[PDB]
Design a protein around this ligand. Structure first.
Ligand SMILES: OC[C@H]1O[C@@H]2O[C@H]3[C@H](O)[C@@H](O)[C@@H](O[C@H]4[C@H](O)[C@@H](O)[C@@H](O[C@H]5[C@H](O)[C@@H](O)[C@@H](O[C@H]6[C@H](O)[C@@H](O)[C@@H](O[C@H]7[C@H](O)[C@@H](O)[C@@H](O[C@H]1[C@H](O)[C@H]2O)O[C@@H]7CO)O[C@@H]6CO)O[C@@H]5CO)O[C@@H]4CO)O[C@@H]3CO
Length: 491
């Protein structure tokens, strides 16, 4: 017993591009001042993208870890821990983007002659942010499969960073699984014109995923079934489409077959690469983590359109998040849910948005499957009402004065370190959010004091067959949330 058993750690994402496209850590001195500000405020650690496109730029297995070694060196000197993201995706690239980091140019050159390695919508547009799950086991990248590329990157990371791993700097390894490092399809690409609150588009039209679907429907006894031709366009509203309207194609046997195939592609993608990540970090004192997106728009209508096009097959009578938490339990991994601050009342009504009940459904699913749940805010916020919503989600039933809370999140990573955060009046409110996350205790350098000790990563438990995974689609009632935190930052 102790209020310290109530402590939930706070981490801060580092600036995008802190080491740049040229693999140079540009300004150790500037980062250093900022990192020391963060250490004085009581922040437990930081999070950084380890961009595949910077490190394996020159060619297959041509890795240069030097600028990231210097960055981890400086973080360790500032007394902070680190969450490392194995970022196999593109950063930025659209209008007025601050940073643009693509994937390896050598992979991009293969895609010049085989455009089907990228995610593709019905119109034939290639999204180059991430390699389609269709080429995961295709040996077409100079003799390697895309999962062997990801596996090798993680093994080289473990060998060349083993002194930071052995010294306990790195708290967890987040492994990037899609666009923006999240396990999902690129269904809402800003770059292709999408604008909130639109339903997005299915991204299964590359030749590998289409050839896969057609063989599957032929085996289910319906060889004549096709991919959606009536789901509309990025910016539609669902009732405007044949697929998502009342009694439309999604409710059909053909539509339910497609939606089960499409969302299952992500579960097996997630499970095979995390199989690799557990081999690469076996024995290290690190926890594995993945990022799931919070797609709250259209959550309040029956068709949950934006979630379905993203690959999350979540309906009111079908839980599409607790199969992901179940799959994560054999790898002993954490579910990092990337949206934690929004309130429904902040949403335009015509978006039919349910941020607060999407969170209660995803975190209750994880704690029910007995995994650890972490999260991030989705958009930069500096105000107390955002911060008080993060703290309510961090500990849904308040502080337990008498022991550990029944329910608590494993960590929260705040989106971005910026000069704005550090502005004097903003930083004084961030300091109080850190205090309340810590349940009013000072920062605690030793995690074991607050029951966060990290053990050497055990080997993955056995494969869970997809029929036992999909049993977790049975809808359950969420655990109860307090209406408001008992540890307010105070407006
Ligand atoms: O590069 C863009 C953006 O990318 C990443 O954000 C994700 C986000 O994490 C996802 O959840 C999703 O976001 C949805 C929201 O969930 C949804 O509510 C809606 O958001 C509206 C906001 O609610 C509304 O306030 C307003 O947003 C403002 C915003 O408050 C401003 O701060 C400013 O936003 C910029 C950010 O400040 C900047 O960091 C960057 O954001 C990244 C983000 O860091 C990253 O996590 O760019 C944005 C855009 O300029 O301006 C906006 C208004 O322009 O309006 C939005 C709707 O326009 O919609 C978003 C998606 O639009 O998806 C994003 C994108 O992948």
């Amino acid at each position: 017993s102790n209020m310290l058993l109530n402590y939930v750690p706070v981490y801060v994402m580092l600036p995008l591009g802190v080491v740049n496209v040229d693999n140079v850590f540009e300004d150790p001195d500037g980062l250093k001042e900022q990192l020391l500000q963060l250490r004085a405020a009581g922040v437990d650690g930081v999070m950084v993208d380890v961009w595949w496109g910077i490190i394996e730029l020159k060619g297959p297995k041509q890795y240069d870890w030097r600028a990231y070694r210097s960055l981890f060196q400086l973080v360790q000197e500032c007394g902070l821990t680190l969450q490392a993201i194995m970022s196999f995706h593109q950063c930025g690239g659209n209008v007025g983007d601050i940073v643009n980091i693509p994937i390896p140019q050598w992979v991009l050159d293969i895609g010049e002659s085989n455009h089907d390695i990228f995610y593709t919508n019905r119109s034939g547009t290639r999204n180059k942010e991430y390699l389609t799950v269709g080429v995961d086991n295709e040996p077409i990248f100079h003799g390697r499969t895309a999962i062997e590329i990801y596996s090798d990157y993680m093994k080289s990371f473990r060998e060349n960073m083993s002194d930071f791993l052995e010294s306990g700097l790195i708290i967890d390894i987040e492994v990037g699984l899609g666009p923006a490092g999240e396990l999902r399809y690129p269904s809402y690409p800003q770059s292709q014109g999408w604008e909130f609150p639109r339903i997005g588009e299915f991204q299964c039209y590359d030749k590998y995923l289409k050839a896969d679907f057609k063989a599957a429907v032929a085996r289910a006894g319906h060889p004549e079934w096709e991919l959606p031709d009536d789901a509309g366009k990025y910016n539609d509203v669902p009732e405007s489409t044949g697929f998502f309207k009342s009694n439309g194609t999604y409710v059909t046997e053909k539509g339910k077959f497609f939606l089960t195939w499409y969302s299952n592609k992500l579960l097996n993608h997630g499970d095979q690469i995390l199989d690799e990540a557990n081999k690469a970090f076996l024995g290290c004192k690190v926890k594995l983590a993945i990022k799931v997106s919070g797609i709250h728009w259209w959550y309040k209508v029956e068709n949950h359109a934006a979630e379905l096009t993203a690959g999350y097959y979540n309906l009111n009578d079908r839980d599409g998040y607790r199969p992901i938490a179940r799959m994560l339990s054999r790898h002993h991994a954490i579910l990092n849910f990337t949206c934690l601050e929004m309130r429904d009342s902040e949403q335009p009504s015509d978006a039919k948005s349910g941020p607060q009940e999407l969170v209660q459904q995803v975190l209750s699913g994880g704690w029910r499957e007995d995994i650890r749940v972490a999260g991030e805010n989705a958009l930069p916020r500096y105000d107390a009402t955002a911060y008080n919503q993060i703290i309510l989600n961090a500990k849904p039933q308040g502080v337990n004065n008498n022991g550990p809370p029944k329910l608590s999140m494993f960590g929260v990573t705040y989106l971005r370190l910026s000069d704005d955060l550090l502005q004097k009046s903003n930083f004084n409110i961030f300091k109080k959010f850190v205090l309340k996350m810590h349940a009013d205790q000072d920062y605690c350098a030793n995690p074991q004091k607050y029951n966060h000790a990290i053990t050497p990563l055990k080997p993955s438990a056995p494969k869970i067959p997809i029929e036992v995974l999909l049993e977790a689609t049975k809808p359950t009632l969420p655990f109860p949330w307090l209406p408001e935190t008992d540890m307010k930052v105070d407006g």
